[PDB]
Amino acid sequence: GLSDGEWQQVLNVWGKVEADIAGHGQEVLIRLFTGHPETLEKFDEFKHLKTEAEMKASEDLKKHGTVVLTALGGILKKKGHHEAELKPLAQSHATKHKIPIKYLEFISDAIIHVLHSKHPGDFGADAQGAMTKALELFRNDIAAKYKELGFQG
């Protein structure tokens, strides 16, 4: 779905996330939860949080941010040859967690936001381009597996 040049850019950018996977992970989830409060309800571990401050002071949330970005990073490093790593992820988000693909769209957007926020001026037009496409590829492959399961919504 991407050229090596574009994969090259995705992994360059990923290097920025890797310098602080917890702070990036936390800011992604807070952006998600504050822009779409209904997503919070999918987590029994975090639905207690009400304010952004409480979210900001939650170490467990930072922990989960790490788990998420660790797993994404692992997929991205496969440069599209991620069937093995993605399948389990699509299966648990569809039948156990009951996560609509729109929420994956939401988090995808939330990653681009955060990158711009944390790195104003050094998250280029080409880098946005490649990152967006990889996130889309990720989303599409998930959508394929959702379809097979009839996870309709």
Ligand code: HEM
């Ligand atoms: C970048 C996209 C995502 C990645 C890489 C990711 C990754 C993970 C991983 C690795 C786990 C734990 C293992 C498992 O249960 O599969 C997990 C758990 C979970 N995810 Fe995601 N996830 C993503 C998006 C989302 C979104 C958008 C939602 C909801 C809005 C969500 C809701 C959950 C929930 C409810 C759990 C169970 C948490 C627990 O009780 O510990 N995920 N996710």
